């Protein structure tokens, strides 16, 4: 339905949020606002990190959602303060806790997917 973006970050909407994330072994959602300043700093810190992961292996794709238009989704994740990142595993949200820097974010997402020998 929605396909026409030249980048690494994916735009998930309340219409294709549970349909795309569920089809993503491991994806990270970052709720941002087109009016939130702090975000203006994360924008590049997020879009960039996506390039590092996308090239990494296993490649961990990232997605950016607008809590302003997708409020329905935000409330679902008790999003009351952006930026707000959260990991999703086959439809399993997990409070993202770690560095909010291009590098950090990447390094973290990695250890999450399975830093070492994990099960399940």
UniProtKB/Swiss-Prot annotation:
Entry's localization field: Endoplasmic reticulum lumen; Melanosome
Thioredoxin domain location = 8-114
Instruction: Classify the source by domain of life.
Output: Eukaryota
Q: List the disulfide bonds.
A: 36-39
Any coiled-coil regions, as ranges: none
Question: What's the subunit arrangement here?
Answer: Part of a large chaperone multiprotein complex comprising DNAJB11, HSP90B1, HSPA5, HYOU, PDIA2, PDIA4, PDIA6, PPIB, SDF2L1, UGGT1 and very small amounts of ERP29, but not, or at very low levels, CALR nor CANX. Component of a complex containing at least CRELD2, MANF, MATN3 and PDIA4.
Q: Which family does it belong to?
A: Belongs to the protein disulfide isomerase family.
Indicate what this protein is called per its UniProt record: Protein disulfide-isomerase A4
Q: Tell me what gene encodes this.
A: Pdia4
Complete-protein stretch covered: 171 to 277 of 638
